[PDB]
Design a protein around this ligand. Structure first.
Ligand SMILES: *Cc1c(COP(=O)(O)O)cnc(C)c1O
Ligand SMILES: *Cc1c(COP(=O)(O)O)cnc(C)c1O
Lengths: 396, 396
């Protein structure tokens, strides 16, 4: 039965992990996957998380199944974090949230939901973008179209090209927007641009789908959600796939959420029942631990205070490494100017390397990055920054 | 976009949870979902699990993503538990295991894998059976056919009817067998019958798929895996979806495994790469906590000893409640003899109630069971047994 199965192609992002595993060279530098590293090159468990896990260990009395949609408190806190503590969406009970195994899992649930319950046939994603998007929607049977987004020479959002591309998207089409910290460009719309996109979306009849995996890494928790909120204010329906993998450092616990919004409470409840049906035939119910940690932290004033500071520290260390990266690059002999890196939000550096240069960085210098030229700045430390820049200058 | 979505039908098993939620009557009895209850009507966290979680809290230094297939140790221990510590499948590297979000999640991964990578078009499941099977495979685009299994009057496995039904299954068809503790009948093939099925399977060219969610609840860990092992000895290829939800009381942590077996190491590795591709476009990587607990317990002699005893205690309490149930039924005036219940393995009682009787038990007595007439014996306690039997006698 399996004699003729073909070897699947490696994942352009997750496949780096396997290569790093093989390479036995002493000082290889991992700047691939978007995971936070501290000054010591370690991906630590947040202190707030350790405290929450301590609390769970002493108070948990059962591991009996959660409902299909997960921890009710978790969904409440997620909606507040997304739409604002006193939002109308919450007051009018227009939103329902299902806890999912990571943001990726949330995207898969959204995809199965749309494919089976609506007339949607196309999903629009940005280019450059995040490869997993095309893969997930395609697997659900939806075709993926791309819309321009980046001005490769000025290193800014090409708003005009964006609007021109999206004009080809018809009513009923899904349009996927990155909530903040666009992966991989790190260039996000200004509030005024978000507002224009929100209005344009309503008029064209698009169904906005937001991928929100970096809330808090651009400017702040609330500020980073202003684009989404601009949309939520004018739209009757929308979908949000969010993740706590990065802002809580809970990567491997798979903590995400798929939030569905409808015109009214009656409609969202009917639609949500179908979303639950899509979950039932997938993994049945979500994993408790990760989400339990999140709900505990977000519902406890003390733990929340600690967590918000840790998030702020992560954001600040990254922004600090960006400056050092640029500075070290100049004092190392870089013939090209990478100052444009400073404008980029999130964990990545993007736009200055070709796929050949990335290959050479790996083969000759043991430096690992994504073929698109995306480097994880969050993986840069004061210790590996010197050899890192010397290698880059060598391939420029 | 969502104006015309239809309300999804409730799940015949998981939907009971919602009804129990609504019913505000004081002493309702939950005998629905197959979850273990102790003598106090509580679903406790095993002591071995608490100890493992304690260990993780103190030694975990990161929550960085696990690989697509999960914790390597977890897969090793799962293969030993299934095929035997020194099995040839393991020696010959003919098996690969992916950690999954529960046994259900494993079934979904198996389904997506088969649908996209093989010529399989049909999956055969027993009737009576477990409703989730049809739902999951159907969602993956595979048609489900049923094969006879139960002798409703003698309350035994109708081996002849089973073989007659399966004769309609053609080479290339998948045949799903419950590893032990058949849900819901509780009637399993004897070792001799398993051996006959194993031989018949090889000759007809079926691809066996085992759903193993109750290893340890029939007779014992090793004994319960003899059927699967009989198959593994004669088959070149097979699939096993196992779960740790019940034997570890880790329900909500979603701890499962999908094991793939091929003729050789080369073939299984190629096929497994495609299974990983099916996972990547679903939830990406599995949740760490639950599986970490399992690997810690199974790899530590002391913790394992404790866990095996707790499992033995659960099995024994259930078997004890079966006797009491039958006895209390007789001394309560039951006009019918339910002694056949004693032969049934696992957590359920099946075969003596109609769907109307179950409805009346709910409406009039607050007793909840599945419409098929399946009652969770593991939910019976010395405290609720009296009112439970009085209600049953009333509807007989
Ligand atoms: C990290 C990320 C996600 C979700 O990751 P999970 O690990 O599945 O929670 C989704 N989209 C983008 C663009 C991301 O960077
Ligand atoms: C419990 C069970 C499963 C798997 O349950 P999970 O909670 O998904 O691990 C699968 N099949 C049967 C027949 C079961 O009883």
């Amino acid at each position: 039965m399996f004699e003729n199965i073909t070897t699947a192609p490696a994942d352009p992002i997750l496949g780096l992990a396997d290569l790093l595993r093989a390479d036995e060279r002493p000082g290889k530098i991992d700047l691939g996957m978007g995971v936070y590293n501290d000054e010591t090159g370690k991906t630590p468990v947040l202190t707030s998380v350790k405290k929450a896990e301590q609390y769970l260990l002493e108070n948990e009395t059962t591991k009996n199944y959660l409902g299909i949609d997960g921890i009710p408190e978790f969904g409440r806190c997620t909606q507040e974090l997304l739409f604002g503590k006193g939002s109308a969406l919450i007051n009018d009970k227009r939103a329902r949230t299902a806890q999912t195994p990571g943001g990726t899992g949330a995207l898969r649930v959204a995809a199965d939901f749309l494919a089976k319950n609506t007339s949607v046939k196309r999903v629009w994603v940005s280019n450059p973008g995040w490869p997993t998007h095309k893969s997930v929607f395609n697997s659900a049977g939806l075709e993926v179209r791309e819309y321009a987004y980046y001005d490769a020479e000025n290193h800014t959002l090409d708003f005009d090209a964006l609007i021109n591309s999206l004009n080809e998207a018809q009513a009923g089409d899904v349009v996927l927007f990155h909530g903040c910290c666009h992966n991989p460009t790190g260039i996000d719309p200004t509030l005024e641009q978000w507002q224009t996109l929100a209005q344009l979306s309503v008029e064209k009849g698009w169904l906005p789908l937001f991928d929100f995996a970096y809330q808090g890494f651009a400017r702040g928790l609330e500020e980073d959600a202003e684009g989404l909120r601009a949309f939520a204010a004018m739209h009757k329906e929308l979908i949000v796939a969010s993740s706590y993998s990065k802002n809580f450092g809970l990567y491997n616990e798979r903590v995400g959420a798929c939030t569905l919004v409808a015109a009214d409470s009656e409609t969202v409840d009917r639609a949500f029942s179908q979303m639950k049906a899509a979950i039932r035939v997938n993994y049945s119910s979500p994993p408790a631990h990760g989400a339990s940690v999140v709900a505990t932290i977000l519902s406890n004033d003390a733990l929340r205070a600690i967590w918000e500071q840790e998030l702020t520290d992560m954001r600040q260390r990254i922004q600090r490494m960006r400056q050092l990266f640029v500075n070290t690059l100049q004092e190392k002999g870089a013939n090209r100017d990478f100052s444009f890196t400073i404008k980029q939000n999130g964990m990545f550096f993007f736009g200055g390397l070709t796929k050949e240069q990335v290959l050479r960085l790996r083969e000759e210098f043991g430096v690992y990055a994504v073929a698109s030229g995306r480097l994880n700045v969050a993986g840069m430390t004061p210790d590996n920054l010197a050899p890192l820049c010397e290698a880059i200058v060598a391939v420029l």
